[PDB]
């Protein structure tokens, strides 16, 4: 069995009667999930996986694009020199777990090695016909509704010395975030101060451990800070909830100066800058009522500041980032890879 990238197909637990858009797309593009999913282990054998050059990430990317294309239709869309006007009805939008499976003659290799940084050899290796249930959550800064690491916090980067390589963080304890909108564009999220400082404490120390172990970059203390620039989609924690686009200020989350919870002032926008293509999409005004989303902060997207020449200092600054939704997919597709029989 040799490595290959074939033509995967999707499978989900979507319902035929559901009006929600993820269920509607998955009903016509996918199949019913495996009632008894087999996972045959492969003992006395090891093999290497690479999450950063995985074609499974690219397939999930363009599927979520076509999902967003036919689901969240904007009123006016500006792409290139063309203006695309279309109907923009208010829809119900909530992601569901999606499984990716290998066609006839192929299989998927799953690595069950605990504390796996994304690359290198794997002792625990099993074969599955499908992945696990992955919610295609499109978020920024904070990875929501993802999977948790069984051991400590795991730090993933294709090259930790490259400051352009975004660092994908995967938490071990979920940080519950409660966003709500009772100005019909003013919302706010609430997050417990105790659990966020505790998780931040464990993430800072894990960043220090992985840089002291695998990198020649040495620093005494780890420090966070708000992003230095960019569009509002990445300078804030941007996500989708009930069809509306939320832009939440995370300055309080990444403020070093540290009572119950932490309140993040949000803002719903009608004009967003799309992630699936280059252009802006104008959506309809928000719907009335109490719009509430309770999600799990399961991961972080961070970039490291450029080092000073001939300097190191006791402090290294990390900042939340986002934009490329491929990193959101490989935060779950890291353990899987396609094999050919």
């Amino acid at each position, epitope marked *: 069995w040799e490595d290959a990238d074939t033509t995967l197909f999707c499978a989900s637990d979507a319902k035929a009667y559901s009006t929600e858009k993820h269920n509607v797309w998955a009903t016509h593009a996918c199949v019913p999930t495996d009632p008894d999913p087999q996972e045959i282990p492969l003992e006395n054998v090891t093999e290497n996986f690479n999450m950063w050059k995985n074609n499974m990430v690219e397939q999930m990317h363009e599927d979520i694009i076509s999902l967003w294309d036919e689901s969240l239709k904007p009123c006016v869309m500006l792409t290139g020199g063309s203006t695309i006007k279309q109907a923009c009805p208010k829809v119900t939008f909530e992601p569901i777990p999606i499984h990716y499976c290998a066609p006839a003659g192929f299989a998927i290799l799953k690595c069950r090695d605990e504390d796996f940084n994304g690359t290198g050899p794997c002792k625990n290796v099993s074969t599955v016909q499908c992945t696990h249930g992955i919610k295609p959550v499109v978020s920024t800064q904070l990875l929501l509704n993802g999977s948790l690491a069984k051991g400590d916090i795991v730090i993933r980067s294709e090259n930790l010395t490259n400051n352009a390589k975004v660092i994908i963080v995967q938490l071990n304890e979920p940080v519950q975030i409660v966003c709500i909108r009772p100005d019909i564009r003013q919302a706010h999220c609430n997050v417990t101060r105790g659990k966020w400082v505790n998780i931040t404490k464990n993430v800072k120390e894990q960043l220090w451990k992985i840089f002291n172990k695998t990198t020649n970059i040495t620093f005494n203390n780890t420090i966070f800070n708000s992003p230095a*620039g960019g569009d509002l989609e*990445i300078t804030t924690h941007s996500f989708n909830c009930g069809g509306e686009f939320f832009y939440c200020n995370t300055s309080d989350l990444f403020n070093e100066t540290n009572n119950e919870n932490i309140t993040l002032q949000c803002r719903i926008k009608q004009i967003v800058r799309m992630w699936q293509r*280059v252009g802006q999409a104008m959506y309809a005004p928000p719907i009335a009522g109490n719009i509430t989303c309770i999600s799990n902060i399961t991961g972080l997207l961070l970039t490291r*500041d450029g*080092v000073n020449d001939t*300097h190191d200092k006791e402090n290294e600054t990390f900042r939340p980032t986002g*934009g490329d939704m491929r990193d959101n997919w490989r935060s779950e597709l890291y353990k899987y890879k396609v094999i050919k029989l």
Partner: antibody, heavy 122, light 104 residues
């Protein structure tokens, strides 16, 4: 195919500000990181910062974060570099360069702007 | 921080000679090493990317080599157009350069 054109030379006084533009053409603008390098007279090239033109995510080398602003215009496919609080030590030739990899960061700069001379003198 | 050291600083060359300059790194690099040609009054030009992969448009005489902490740029048959400075780069760390002039 990929072409990067910058702005002309800049005459500045110590403490003033300078804007250098970088017009791109012939390639997908938002799919290649734009780097900014400067070369002081008699010294080597030094990195000051890059920008990912998709959403404008930026990073800087040590020291430049305090007074350099990297921006871009996605519609017109043009990047900008703003430097405030100019010192005489900032007299150098500034380059904007394009990463060769599509949607990746290899630091291999294949397309270069012609350069912009900035001289900070009293 | 990664130190980049090039040698020699300046080298005497004759038309048609086999030239080889060295690039050194303070730590294990591996492969993502890039070489550039720089003539006065113009922008630097990418010659080799990733140790040995030659960029499109570069003449066949150029060739890169090396591993870990030592890398070499090689010109098989030098011509008049090849008289310039040559940098080696890794991440944001450029080398100070190796200058080439005609020997008489």
């Amino acid at each position: 195919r990929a072409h990067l054109v910058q702005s002309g030379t800049a005459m500045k006084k110590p403490g003033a500000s300078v804007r250098v533009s970088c017009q791109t053409s012939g390639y997908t603008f938002t799919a290649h990181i734009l780097f900014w390098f400067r070369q002081a007279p008699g010294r080597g090239l030094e990195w000051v910062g890059w920008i990912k033109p998709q959403y404008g995510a930026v990073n800087f080398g040590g020291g430049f974060r305090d007074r350099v602003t990297l921006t871009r215009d996605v519609y017109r496919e043009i990047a900008y570099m703003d430097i405030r609080g100019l010192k005489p030590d900032d007299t150098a030739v500034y380059y904007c360069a394009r990463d060769r990899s599509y949607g990746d960061s290899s630091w291999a700069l294949d397309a270069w702007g012609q350069g912009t001379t900035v001289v900070v003198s009293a | 921080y990664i130190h980049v050291t090039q040698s020699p600083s300046s080298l005497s060359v004759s038309i048609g000679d086999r030239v080889t300059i060295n690039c050194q790194t303070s730590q294990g690099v591996g492969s993502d090493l890039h070489w550039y040609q720089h003539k006065p009054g113009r922008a630097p030009k990418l010659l080799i990317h990733h140790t040995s992969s030659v960029e499109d448009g570069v003449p066949s005489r150029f060739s890169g080599s090396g591993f870990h902490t030592s890398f070499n740029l090689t010109i098989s048959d030098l011509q008049a157009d090849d008289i310039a400075t040559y940098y080696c780069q890794v991440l944001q760390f450029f080398g100070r350069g190796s200058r080439l002039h005609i020997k008489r």
